[PDB]
Amino acid sequence: EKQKKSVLEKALKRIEENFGKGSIMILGDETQVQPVEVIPTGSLAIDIATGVGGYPRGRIVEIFGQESSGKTTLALHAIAEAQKMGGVAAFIDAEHALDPVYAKNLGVDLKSLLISQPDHGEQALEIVDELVRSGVVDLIVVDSVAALVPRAEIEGAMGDMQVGLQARLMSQALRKIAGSVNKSKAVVIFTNQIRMKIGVMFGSPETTTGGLALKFYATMRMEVRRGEPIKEGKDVIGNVISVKIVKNKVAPPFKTAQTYIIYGKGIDREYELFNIAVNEGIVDRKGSWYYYTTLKGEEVSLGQGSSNAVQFLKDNPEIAGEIERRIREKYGLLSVEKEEQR
């Protein structure tokens, strides 16, 4: 039996070591998996689904979905997390749609955010490559792929004989970026659409032709979908989202995270934490009242109903932290270099 697996595992290793880490995996192998350096996503559910607890440094990630799916909110959290760790984030903007007020409330430090609003696709991708190469930037969000229009097309020259030269030019710029990110501490995230293709009408594959290179250059690809409304009494206060990791080269793919966007706040860390804790049986419910037992044995009353329990978590960071660590440990994420005393 085990001899069957050790020959198996050994062969898997051989192939994997032949073609690069993550080249082949056992889909059920959350063993452990092995931590790599990541920037957390801002969602505990997504962190779990990635298998490594976040976006891996030195890699490209694609986040795609319809307009208004929640991909914008994910990208803003990625920025916020990169800043929170003490890093520097850049936003390469071809949409011109940022809501600075939402971004700030969600947790982005607007003052320190680097911003570029490039003239065209090639320039955008060259700026990204230089930023990666500079060594000074932790996380770059590129929004978005579709908007990434070739110079010539913009100047309306399409043209002289070759219409698809840029396709190659873009794929080439991307290849440069892939080259540079491997030697860097940077995470590079591209957001991409499945909605409203440009310039006119009906659709080719949702993700764009630069996207093919993206499809293959990316270490993770995440498909975001808007789910059911969330209501507090008779007000809708947000909606559920699902985030399916359709490609993952550092842990097993095809995990789907369910998480929650609260309007005006983003993926509220305490709201998500409460729901996950409750789903995991770590916080329990006695009638309408919620309770938690600390590791040290204290049984603590979180309050009556979800809204009170979520606020309690906000008012009691030390308890929230413990509940979160327990969840992360359970799924093998806890960094574990964490030191206790302060």
Side-chain angles (χ1 to χ4, degrees), residues 36-232:
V36 291
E37 304 194 60
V38 296
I39 300 166
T41 65
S43 169
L44 171 62
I46 301 171
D47 287 350
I48 290 174
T50 66
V52 290
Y55 306 114
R57 293 191 179 267
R59 308 290 187 105
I60 297 174
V61 171
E62 181 181 10
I63 302 184
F64 65 95
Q66 294 180 32
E67 208 191 83
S68 309
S69 50
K71 68 187 163 60
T72 298
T73 291
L74 258 313
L76 293 175
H77 279 282
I79 290 168
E81 292 295 327
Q83 296 180 132
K84 202 158 306 205
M85 308 171 62
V88 170
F91 178 37
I92 314 297
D93 169 35
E95 305 295 351
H96 308 349
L98 181 80
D99 180 342
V101 167
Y102 179 63
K104 182 181 178 165
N105 199 38
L106 178 158
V108 172
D109 178 7
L110 290 166
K111 297 169 168 282
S112 307
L113 221 208
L114 318 189
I115 174 66
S116 168
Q117 295 180 123
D119 307 321
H120 48 258
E122 38 266 83
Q123 181 186 104
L125 295 175
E126 283 164 10
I127 289 166
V128 174
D129 190 56
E130 296 197 29
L131 278 172
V132 167
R133 288 201 214 262
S134 76
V136 195
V137 168
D138 294 283
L139 184 133
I140 301 173
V141 172
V142 185
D143 172 43
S144 67
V145 165
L148 293 168
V149 186
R151 183 154 199 149
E153 172 176 351
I154 284 170
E155 305 171 357
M158 54 173 306
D160 224 23
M161 283 162 60
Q162 89 273 79
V163 31
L165 180 151
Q166 261 100 346
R168 290 183 57 209
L169 269 193
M170 302 302 208
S171 288
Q172 204 172 239
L174 209 55
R175 177 183 157 183
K176 301 201 180 188
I177 292 161
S180 307
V181 310
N182 296 345
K183 298 88 173 314
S184 77
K185 63 178 180 178
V187 174
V188 179
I189 294 170
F190 292 81
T191 73
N192 198 180
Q193 222 87 184
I194 307 192
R195 283 278 80 190
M196 266 91 257
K197 141 313 192 68
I198 41 189
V200 226
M201 190 185 70
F202 234 20
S204 100
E206 344 71 75
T207 300
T208 115
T209 130
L212 211 84
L214 183 46
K215 181 163 194 159
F216 298 106
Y217 285 117
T219 290
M220 299 183 174
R221 303 179 65 236
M222 309 189 158
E223 168 177 34
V224 184
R225 295 177 124 285
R226 176 167 61 177
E228 290 293 300
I230 295 165
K231 51 230 328 296
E232 202 174 57

Side-chain angles (χ1 to χ4, degrees), residues 44 48 272-274 276-278 280 282 321-334:
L44 171 62
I48 290 174
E272 184 193 47
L273 180 64
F274 174 71
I276 295 180
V278 164
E280 296 282 328
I282 285 170
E322 173 174 309
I323 294 175
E324 174 196 348
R325 283 186 295 268
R326 290 179 51 170
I327 296 163
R328 294 187 180 271
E329 285 171 1
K330 174 169 175 175
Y331 282 95
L333 296 186
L334 210 311

Side-chain angles (χ1 to χ4, degrees), residues 64 221-225 242-247 254-257:
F64 65 95
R221 303 179 65 236
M222 309 189 158
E223 168 177 34
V224 184
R225 295 177 124 285
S242 57
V243 176
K244 185 180 178 176
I245 318 289
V246 301
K247 189 197 191 179
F254 301 117
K255 285 167 188 309
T256 293

Side-chain angles (χ1 to χ4, degrees), residues 280-301:
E280 296 282 328
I282 285 170
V283 156
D284 31 68
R285 185 180 65 83
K286 301 175 188 178
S288 187
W289 293 79
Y290 292 87
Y291 293 93
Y292 174 62
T293 298
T294 67
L295 287 161
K296 225 189 295 186
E298 181 190 4
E299 208 205 2
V300 7
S301 174

